[PDB]
Design an enzyme around this catalytic site. Structure first.
Site, PDB file in Angstrom:
ATOM      1  N   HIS A  72       0.829  -1.211   0.000  1.00  0.00           N
ATOM      2  CA  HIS A  72       0.000   0.000   0.000  1.00  0.00           C
ATOM      3  C   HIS A  72       0.864   1.263   0.000  1.00  0.00           C
ATOM      4  O   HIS A  72       0.853   2.067   0.932  1.00  0.00           O
ATOM      5  CB  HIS A  72      -0.935  -0.022   1.197  1.00  0.00           C
ATOM      6  CG  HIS A  72      -1.990  -1.067   1.092  1.00  0.00           C
ATOM      7  ND1 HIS A  72      -1.924  -2.274   1.762  1.00  0.00           N
ATOM      8  CD2 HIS A  72      -3.142  -1.092   0.380  1.00  0.00           C
ATOM      9  CE1 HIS A  72      -2.989  -2.994   1.459  1.00  0.00           C
ATOM     10  NE2 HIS A  72      -3.738  -2.301   0.619  1.00  0.00           N
ATOM     11  N   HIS A  76       1.276   1.322  -5.785  1.00  0.00           N
ATOM     12  CA  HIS A  76      -0.102   0.848  -5.823  1.00  0.00           C
ATOM     13  C   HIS A  76      -1.063   1.981  -6.166  1.00  0.00           C
ATOM     14  O   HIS A  76      -1.979   1.784  -6.963  1.00  0.00           O
ATOM     15  CB  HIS A  76      -0.473   0.196  -4.486  1.00  0.00           C
ATOM     16  CG  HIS A  76      -1.940  -0.093  -4.322  1.00  0.00           C
ATOM     17  ND1 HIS A  76      -2.613  -1.032  -5.074  1.00  0.00           N
ATOM     18  CD2 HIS A  76      -2.857   0.430  -3.470  1.00  0.00           C
ATOM     19  CE1 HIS A  76      -3.881  -1.071  -4.700  1.00  0.00           C
ATOM     20  NE2 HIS A  76      -4.054  -0.191  -3.726  1.00  0.00           N
ATOM     21  N   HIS A 112      -6.564   7.210  -2.601  1.00  0.00           N
ATOM     22  CA  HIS A 112      -7.446   6.259  -1.928  1.00  0.00           C
ATOM     23  C   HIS A 112      -6.743   5.442  -0.851  1.00  0.00           C
ATOM     24  O   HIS A 112      -7.434   4.878  -0.002  1.00  0.00           O
ATOM     25  CB  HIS A 112      -8.111   5.301  -2.926  1.00  0.00           C
ATOM     26  CG  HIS A 112      -7.290   4.090  -3.242  1.00  0.00           C
ATOM     27  ND1 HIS A 112      -6.227   4.113  -4.124  1.00  0.00           N
ATOM     28  CD2 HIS A 112      -7.359   2.827  -2.765  1.00  0.00           C
ATOM     29  CE1 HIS A 112      -5.693   2.902  -4.187  1.00  0.00           C
ATOM     30  NE2 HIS A 112      -6.353   2.108  -3.365  1.00  0.00           N
ATOM     31  N   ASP A 113      -5.398   5.383  -0.845  1.00  0.00           N
ATOM     32  CA  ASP A 113      -4.685   4.651   0.208  1.00  0.00           C
ATOM     33  C   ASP A 113      -3.623   5.511   0.895  1.00  0.00           C
ATOM     34  O   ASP A 113      -2.704   4.969   1.512  1.00  0.00           O
ATOM     35  CB  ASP A 113      -4.022   3.373  -0.346  1.00  0.00           C
ATOM     36  CG  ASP A 113      -4.938   2.142  -0.324  1.00  0.00           C
ATOM     37  OD1 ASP A 113      -5.882   2.060   0.508  1.00  0.00           O
ATOM     38  OD2 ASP A 113      -4.717   1.232  -1.151  1.00  0.00           O
ATOM     39  N   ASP A 227      -8.734  -1.275  -7.816  1.00  0.00           N
ATOM     40  CA  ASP A 227      -8.056  -1.624  -6.571  1.00  0.00           C
ATOM     41  C   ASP A 227      -7.796  -3.127  -6.517  1.00  0.00           C
ATOM     42  O   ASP A 227      -6.762  -3.534  -6.015  1.00  0.00           O
ATOM     43  CB  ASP A 227      -8.975  -1.179  -5.409  1.00  0.00           C
ATOM     44  CG  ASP A 227      -8.242  -0.817  -4.097  1.00  0.00           C
ATOM     45  OD1 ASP A 227      -7.061  -0.715  -4.074  1.00  0.00           O
ATOM     46  OD2 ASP A 227      -8.996  -0.600  -3.185  1.00  0.00           O
ATOM     47  N   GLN A 278      -4.045 -17.082  -3.435  1.00  0.00           N
ATOM     48  CA  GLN A 278      -4.356 -16.334  -4.654  1.00  0.00           C
ATOM     49  C   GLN A 278      -5.514 -16.977  -5.404  1.00  0.00           C
ATOM     50  O   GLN A 278      -6.434 -16.285  -5.861  1.00  0.00           O
ATOM     51  CB  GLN A 278      -3.127 -16.237  -5.563  1.00  0.00           C
ATOM     52  CG  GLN A 278      -2.107 -15.184  -5.130  1.00  0.00           C
ATOM     53  CD  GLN A 278      -2.719 -13.810  -4.890  1.00  0.00           C
ATOM     54  OE1 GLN A 278      -3.383 -13.245  -5.760  1.00  0.00           O
ATOM     55  NE2 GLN A 278      -2.499 -13.269  -3.697  1.00  0.00           N
ATOM     56  N   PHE A 281      -8.597 -16.228  -3.501  1.00  0.00           N
ATOM     57  CA  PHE A 281      -8.942 -14.818  -3.656  1.00  0.00           C
ATOM     58  C   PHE A 281      -9.596 -14.563  -5.011  1.00  0.00           C
ATOM     59  O   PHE A 281     -10.600 -13.845  -5.103  1.00  0.00           O
ATOM     60  CB  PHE A 281      -7.685 -13.965  -3.481  1.00  0.00           C
ATOM     61  CG  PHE A 281      -7.935 -12.480  -3.456  1.00  0.00           C
ATOM     62  CD1 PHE A 281      -8.830 -11.923  -2.562  1.00  0.00           C
ATOM     63  CD2 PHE A 281      -7.227 -11.643  -4.301  1.00  0.00           C
ATOM     64  CE1 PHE A 281      -9.038 -10.545  -2.529  1.00  0.00           C
ATOM     65  CE2 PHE A 281      -7.428 -10.267  -4.269  1.00  0.00           C
ATOM     66  CZ  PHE A 281      -8.341  -9.726  -3.388  1.00  0.00           C
TER      67      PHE A 281
END
Ligand SMILES: COc1cc2c(cc1OC)[C@H](CCCc1c[nH]c3ccccc13)N(C=O)CC2
Ligand SMILES: COc1cc2c(cc1OC)[C@H](CCCc1c[nH]c3ccccc13)N(C=O)CC2
Ligand SMILES: [Mg+2]
Ligand SMILES: [Mg+2]
Ligand SMILES: [Zn+2]
Ligand SMILES: [Zn+2]
Lengths: 320, 325
Positions: A72, A76, A112-113, A227, A278, A281
């Protein structure tokens, strides 16, 4: 410095070489990608933003991403910006978000982060952090990212919105808040339910979205897709993103262990399967999201969905 | 003997219409501390939750200090009033044995902190003036998020953690309930809160004991949210000599905000223009569109426990109306 210019010509394409750009730009990927997208979309003249105020803000914003956080960070942020930029051009829309709505989605992606500490909301809540105390356990990080992103506009020569009208600034602020708050993982299922609803009740000529409620929902889901776009990128990029998120997760799980807390999913390095995580996810989160999305904009983004399914197959093959 | 009079007045803590302004004077401007302490003893909360009395008093005095003594309405007297009103509403026959001790503690603690550090201006004023608070909270329940953050942060001051002996699960549950309750005091949530309360009244279930049946968190927290919201909006249901003092105080706060809006070239908020105000018409409108719809629905939920409160509200509406012609 001229290879950097070459790398930036792929700004309108999925799979930009964002790690190369970060190296070539001197760890300033957010700054250069944002500058390039604002030129390409003609936003500096559309909103009368001075070029020097843009650079000053972007560099200050980029400085407030942590360089010692593996995932983050500013790379990113730059990746999510550039991905949102591409999704805004899906033909199933075409010139159909307002220009203000376009600026909001892109600015939201950039901030956003920002100031992310590299640990989850649940970690901040369960450790009684100052951030969770400030924000009453509710979208803790996302509220903070917004507050920092907006507060930095007040630094010297940083107000990139100085020549927006009062109505425009108020409208943009609301849209940016709505979008960034939707990046809270705890809102994913509701966001996906709504996106599904929209697809089923879709009206097209191309998508026809008449009320703000539906349009902000699309922009929310769009930036959310961006994202969660790592598994949809060329595998060489995706594998680097996996390396970085796992580094961040393991460092947090170590903290949970030491504190005697339950270790968060995928965060226990002594019982971790990176590849199985992964695949799971993709299967439970990223593919449902991107399939729903691809339906909304059918049959655009088939190339993006093609890459996601190729990458899922590859990660599965690495499991013996 | 000042203390003797104060102790006499606090004997009324279970009654609607407590002389809260007298208690504020008699206690040396500590109505929140003395009313909270009285209610905690009356409900045996110190024993139940092993709260050291010196810790309770230290926290209460610190909390009370963080209300602004120079704001006419949203001060420690209002906090004490909402606490005591919630305490009476919790005792209603229709809710006997319905809520746990932890839920009772949450509702009372929420009431005590629910406006702490209020600056005497509205959320919209803070948003429209680009305040630091609205920047921190992204224009969303700006004040109410701040009240919660301050009320919880003060527990960390020296000898202020009144929840030091709760279990971890108790503290977690209390924290979530208190957040859910104070966020429901945001005026922008009133219409949806009332719509839900109406739905519950229309579908309400009662036990063989005759009390309300609340068998899930959603319904339990909804009742506590609306209870504290009713307490927050209880001024027009009080005896007229109390109600008129609350009206004087909110109008002072409104007019001061309007003076700031006017100086800044902003449109003046409703009821805030001292040169174009009708205090009496504004109270009748407030009752007719907000307070009576809410309280009539609460009275239906706990029928017939709140009939006298509703009767007073209607009498007070008639009184203010009679001053207009
Ligand atoms: C490259 O691989 C990854 C990248 C990222 C994540 C996980 C990855 O691999 C498992 C996590 C996911 C954790 C759980 C989670 C976070 N948001 C969500 C939204 C919806 C559903 C779950 C989640 N991220 C958290 O910030 C986003 C970045
Ligand atoms: C004694 O008289 C008053 C006392 C109070 C108010 C208004 C009074 O008289 C009109 C205002 C109402 C303003 C608008 C408003 C605030 N919350 C609401 C909830 C629902 C609907 C409107 C509102 N309050 C604001 O803090 C509570 C105290
Ligand atoms: Mg985030
Ligand atoms: Mg309040
Ligand atoms: Zn992100
Ligand atoms: Zn209040």
């Amino acid at each position: 410095e001229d290879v950097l210019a070459k790398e930036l010509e792929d700004v309108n394409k999925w799979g930009l070489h964002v790690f190369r750009i970060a190296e070539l730009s001197g760890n300033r990927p957010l700054t250069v990608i944002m500058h390039t997208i604002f030129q390409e979309r003609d936003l500096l003249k559309t909103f009368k933003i001075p070029v020097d105020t843009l650079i000053t803000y972007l560099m200050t914003l980029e400085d407030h991403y942590h360089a010692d956080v593996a995932y983050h960070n500013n790379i990113h942020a730059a990746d999510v910006v550039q991905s949102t930029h591409v999704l805004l051009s899906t033909p199933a829309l075409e010139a159909v978000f307002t220009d203000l709505e376009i600026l909001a989605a892109i600015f939201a992606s950039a901030i956003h982060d920002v100031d992310h500490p590299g640990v989850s909301n649940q970690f901040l809540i369960n450790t009684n952090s100052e951030l969770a105390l400030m924000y009453n356990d509710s979208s803790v990080l996302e509220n903070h990212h917004l507050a920092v992103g907006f507060k930095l506009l007040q630094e010297e020569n940083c107000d990139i919105f100085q020549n927006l009208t009062k109505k425009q600034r108020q409208s943009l602020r609301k849209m940016v808040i709505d979008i960034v708050l939707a990046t809270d993982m705890s809102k994913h299922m509701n966001l996906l339910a709504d996106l599904k609803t929209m697809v089923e009740t879709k009206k097209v000529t191309v998508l026809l979205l008449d009320n703000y409620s539906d349009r902000i929902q699309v922009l929310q889901n769009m930036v959310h897709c961006a994202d969660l776009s790592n598994p949809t990128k060329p595998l060489q990029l995706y594998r680097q993103w996996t390396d970085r998120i796992m580094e961040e997760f393991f460092r947090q799980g170590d903290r949970e262990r030491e504190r005697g807390m339950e270790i968060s999913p995928m965060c226990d390095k002594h019982n971790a399967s990176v590849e199985k995580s992964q695949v799971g996810f993709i299967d439970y989160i990223v593919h449902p999201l991107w399939e729903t999305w691809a339906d909304l904009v059918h049959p655009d983004a088939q190339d993006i969905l093609d890459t996601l399914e190729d990458n899922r197959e590859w990660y599965q093959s690495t499991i013996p």
